[PDB]
Amino acid sequence: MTVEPFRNEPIETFQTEEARRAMREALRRVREEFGRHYPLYIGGEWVDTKERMVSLNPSAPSEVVGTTAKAGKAEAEAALEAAWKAFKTWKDWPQEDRSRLLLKAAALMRRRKRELEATLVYEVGKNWVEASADVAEAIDFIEYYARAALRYRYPAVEVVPYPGEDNESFYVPLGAGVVIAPWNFPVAIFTGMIVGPVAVGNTVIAKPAEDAVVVGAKVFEIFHEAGFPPGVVNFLPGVGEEVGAYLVEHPRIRFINFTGSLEVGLKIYEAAGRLAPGQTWFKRAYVETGGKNAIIVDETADFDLAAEGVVVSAYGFQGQKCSAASRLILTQGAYEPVLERVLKRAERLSVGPAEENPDLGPVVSAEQERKVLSYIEIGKNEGQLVLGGKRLEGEGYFIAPTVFTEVPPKARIAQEEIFGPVLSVIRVKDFAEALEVANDTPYGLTGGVYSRKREHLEWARREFHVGNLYFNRKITGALVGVQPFGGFKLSGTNAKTGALDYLRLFLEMKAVAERF
Amino acid sequence: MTVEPFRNEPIETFQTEEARRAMREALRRVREEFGRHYPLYIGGEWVDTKERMVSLNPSAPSEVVGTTAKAGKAEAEAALEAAWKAFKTWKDWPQEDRSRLLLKAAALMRRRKRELEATLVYEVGKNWVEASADVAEAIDFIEYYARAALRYRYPAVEVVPYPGEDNESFYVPLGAGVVIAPWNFPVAIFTGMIVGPVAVGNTVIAKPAEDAVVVGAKVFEIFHEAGFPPGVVNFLPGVGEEVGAYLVEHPRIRFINFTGSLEVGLKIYEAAGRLAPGQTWFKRAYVETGGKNAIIVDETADFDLAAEGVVVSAYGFQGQKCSAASRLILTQGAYEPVLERVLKRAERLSVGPAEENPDLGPVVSAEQERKVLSYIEIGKNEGQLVLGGKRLEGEGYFIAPTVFTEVPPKARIAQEEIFGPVLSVIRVKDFAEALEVANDTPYGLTGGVYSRKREHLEWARREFHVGNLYFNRKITGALVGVQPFGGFKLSGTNAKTGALDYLRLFLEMKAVAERF
Amino acid sequence: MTVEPFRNEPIETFQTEEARRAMREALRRVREEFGRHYPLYIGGEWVDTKERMVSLNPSAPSEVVGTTAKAGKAEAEAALEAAWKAFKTWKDWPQEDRSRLLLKAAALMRRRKRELEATLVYEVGKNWVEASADVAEAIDFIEYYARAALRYRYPAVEVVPYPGEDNESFYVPLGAGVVIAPWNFPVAIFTGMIVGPVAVGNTVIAKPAEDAVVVGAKVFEIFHEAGFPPGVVNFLPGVGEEVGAYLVEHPRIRFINFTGSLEVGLKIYEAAGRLAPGQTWFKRAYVETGGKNAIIVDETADFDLAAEGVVVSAYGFQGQKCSAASRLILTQGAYEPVLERVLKRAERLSVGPAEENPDLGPVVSAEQERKVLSYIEIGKNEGQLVLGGKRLEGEGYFIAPTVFTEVPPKARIAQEEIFGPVLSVIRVKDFAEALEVANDTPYGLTGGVYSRKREHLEWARREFHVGNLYFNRKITGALVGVQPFGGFKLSGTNAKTGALDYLRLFLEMKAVAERF
């Protein structure tokens, strides 16, 4: 190793005056630039288009936070040509050189931390700490993948020798692929999905989520200053499925890296399985498609600790997380004690403009607002509404922390991903039943258990079928390197982000023998 | 390690009297066993059916090597139920226990080596050494995967620690899957495709190729004797696409491991990408789909060494190998010298009943014979026939070693996998043109270069785009452990068999954190 | 590793206002609970008895600090049955699970640090820092052994392979044993002696020292909350030798872990060597039996540094340490300079109620007071009393720092462990003679040398025969992991605590071969 061992970027808590002052300055700088226009980034240069996209402030939707160019099929094709042209030489860069490029990008991002956080606050409605955790995670992905990539350097494969021959196996990148990023972690996941494949020699065309095109553009400003060769990374903000569909079904797209809804993920995986006219390979598609995550609490748990972790997991970033606790499974002995504590804590949560650092900002868009409110109506017909369930005053998309009790395990609100501040509480007889209910959903991303009984925790370690399980702590905020992130079942293909194994997905192996 | 380091099983050459005596007795006993009936193997027991399948001797098709039961949808469903029931407990076996079971199976297979080789001679027409290499490779897969599986034992993932927490990541098997094996390596690949997934905790339903159902049954006799728990491995010989289609599209099949034609592989990959009604996961499909492999020879090569390697690569097992040299690319200076030597060597090759240990036995079936002969007719209008090109006298499916020269790079016989004793010779100006022609096919499995020029060899190491490349030696016969086997492009998904990476394909990762 | 690398728990110095405030609050909480009664802990539950034991405050013996139940043979038998019942399943727990249980216990103990320290202050008379070091050491043992235990996980033995066979050697725990703990480190050593054996699969019956039964009970409150399965750890406070003798001589006690006086240690080792009626194994007995530790100072030393280290080593916790400097060996050139400095420092030491954080609290009991005063009388007949040697005013067992000079090397006070604040100074001609005198005792636990001469230090490294040797620093306070603790000769069996080797003592090995 030529750099210090990996360490996670500290998440700013803003408990110091300096931190608060720095954030206020960043917020002012960002809003003073709400009128900025960000073009597409293709072949190492910013390319503008006739049509544009408008990004709004979810805390005040009548306020524009920026505009960007709008990519169509023509621009997607141009980006693909640039990506393949770049791949021809980028794949030959020594891994040490590619890793240093990533490290430079991380250093540049770290120096623009407050700016990016403030952009997240205004563009997607994250409060201060949620914003800082997002940017810190992005930095972590860059730092982690830069180091992990070196573990695959030429020639990395362990093989059995043979007399009179040299047998050498090594990894090579796949080619040019497309990244389809989410709006809930538009800096962190957007960055990770791009730099992971790029680190080992692939080139990428990235389509940011419509609701977060501005912060995505700022991330590309960092890639540009870092010096990635033209074509290695491309930025294509767009409206609708045009760009994404064109690339996913393209015969010359080598791989697809996607994080988003199951609905879209299913279509992408199906399309990737088809041989487009003239295609000369089997496409690889990696998809992370959300979950319906539960936290189980039994009668032996520290009820106050459990309540706190549940509230953080259920309402952090307004519950707009694939890892969010949307189900609370309580055994009979823990039902009343835990529910009472959860309600008392939840009712004290503040909701308002994200920049004022409330416990909850607004949901991301009018469409998201419509979906969450629709699920709330569905919930009133399946469970018992005991807290919230209403839209709050203001143009911003403010929704109150909501809790439904007596929810049947197979109810729609207990099975479908709402992606909003809505928690469904389910009462069960014992721990065995808690596990059965926890596992009975089409998903398997995150899960948690609050209990002091060792046998219950170890039982869950072996039987709570989720990719990321947490005991006596929140189930959100997986840290790069510490907790490989990815799920089972309909939560995706188990592409563990923030783990050594992630990079292997973007490599193929060659074995070369020479008989002397 | 608790066993000796892995070593490849020696391939018998039958040069000693002892080896010849043992082989003659084995061949006689197998022949005297002609007509035997082998049932299906489901849930730890042999289960017969009303309908049956017949396996013929390609060297004398009027002879019935044996018959087997015929599985339908009902039997497939029963096998799937047994496989999932077995998975529940098999996945919990300590890895050391599962690995010892594999080692036992390898010891049992080793003691039945001559019998298995003799069965290959009669059922699929392999001469003696081709048969020995096949069985040796099967033993190698078992020995290799038994050891490789231990490298993934609980808790195998390297993670970054975090204060006040235990963070443990580990691998777990996927579930019950289906294996669709080829007829050309019915002991080796059949075995490898099954024991790899099983070694790490998965359960399998195996469908042998129609032309090799008898030897597949004998491999299952070994699995049964070894003691694999009921349901862990299941044997389902069948006719047509019924069984395979039913399982590949089944909502309860977790993964598909396939080796065969590109036509079938494309259909399987597409089907695996769809969510069958009620399916609760994204299916994994691994496919190895053949190739159009070339050997390049330039003017600096040892022409005699090259000619020998080309003949072995092109005509071994009648060219019925995904790794077979079906293209010979000669630079201008090497054209006449190498072609003259190849023709002289090829015309001396003996062809006849496999039991006689000829250089070439028969092709595997009447349909395969028809297809190869059809391609020969096509080739006559594309290139210049200079050797063979016809069926020989006899009931067996005997085809003479065939050579076409001055073949256009884009001719059908220079692009499509014939899978028969047909070599297409292409004349190019220089090495650069040779590499261009070598890469210009939809495949990328094996390739070779005969040259003394270091710069050409190293150039090919970087640019001859195939998964398994060989210099100054044959391009067939990849050894387990020594040469990870798998290709690029339409040759498949690059699932490298006989390599540590192979087992990772049949595992998913879980990350569990406990905050103390 | 799944947790951060081991680090020693910092020892609180109470130099901050917060630390002092926290201690004062803990002291108040502890004394407000002086009326508490603590039962025995058997089979996962607190079990009370008719008879009780009273624990007194050595700084004010008329004040009761708590009462506990009193175990007899019947309770010892009940605990033994519970321990064996638990062993049957506890031995099968994955090591990772057992280690996590220890880590939980450490976290719980860390959260109750001040409470435990305050209990040590009131129950055994430790001043503030001595109390904090004790609790910190206990936490260290738990953290260290939890990690060290994983180094022995299945299958940990390195063996030579053999053809056609699997040869696997692994460790397994012994069974149920008894722990007999000391009163001088009633949290640290009490904890270490228990959790070490327990971590690798053994079960334990622990008998706390009579003078420290209350703090021992509080440690068990931690074990109970942590969740050790019923029977794994048992608490049996008792009076006299009844409980200890019954268990040590029991045919069903597998091992004995003891730390205490040589008198008792000799009897335990002798008893362990006998086969009790019906016994089916050779008992293992580990004993740490004190010492008569010396610090040598030659004429090249930093006299001020030496004097400070000597005073700390001789009078820390009133000299009631197996590692305490009870002999000061001075070469002629260092005699006057060092003795003068030692006397000036020692005469400034404060003595009084432990809660006021004096340099010295009271000795632990009336019996200890009687013993120390008796040795002081013996000393007046062997050496020259130059400092202290008197009981101070107050009901508390306050004894002044004492120094005898011109002490013959073979005098009783220069050979027998006083375990009180009594230092014997011996003058010698040169370093060679210093080593001879240092080695001429029946013990060999700790020792120290203050010198700047490299040749003298390295000479001592090779010839000062003690298990724990220190150069130019105090000879007490061995840190877990840093300084494996244990001695030679009559100081014990050299069971190095806080070292990887410690756990091996509680394991036996099995070798299993399978011929395939």
Automatic annotation (TrEMBL), chains A, B, C:
The keyword NAD applies. It is an enzyme of class 1 (oxidoreductase). One of its GO terms (biological process) is L-proline catabolic process to L-glutamate. SUPFAM superfamilies: ALDH-like (SSF53720). Residues 46-512 form the Aldehyde dehydrogenase domain. One of its GO terms (molecular function) is L-glutamate gamma-semialdehyde dehydrogenase activity. Gene3D superfamilies: Aldehyde Dehydrogenase, Chain A, domain 1, Aldehyde Dehydrogenase, Chain A, domain 2. Pathway: Amino-acid degradation; L-proline degradation into L-glutamate; L-glutamate from L-proline: step 2/2. It comes from the Bacteria. PROSITE patterns: ALDEHYDE_DEHYDR_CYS, ALDEHYDE_DEHYDR_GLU. Its EC number is 1.2.1.88. GO terms for cellular component: cytoplasmic side of plasma membrane. Keywords: NAD, Oxidoreductase. The active site is at residue 288. It catalyses: L-glutamate 5-semialdehyde + NAD(+) + H2O = L-glutamate + NADH + 2 H(+). InterPro entries: Ald_DH/histidinol_DH, Ald_DH_C, Ald_DH_CS_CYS, Ald_DH_CS_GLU, Ald_DH_N, Aldehyde_DH_dom, Proline_metab_enzyme, RocA. Belongs to the aldehyde dehydrogenase family. RocA subfamily. NCBIfam families: D1pyr5carbox2, PRK03137.1. This is L-glutamate gamma-semialdehyde dehydrogenase. The lineage of its organism: Bacteria, Thermotogati, Deinococcota, Deinococci, Thermales.
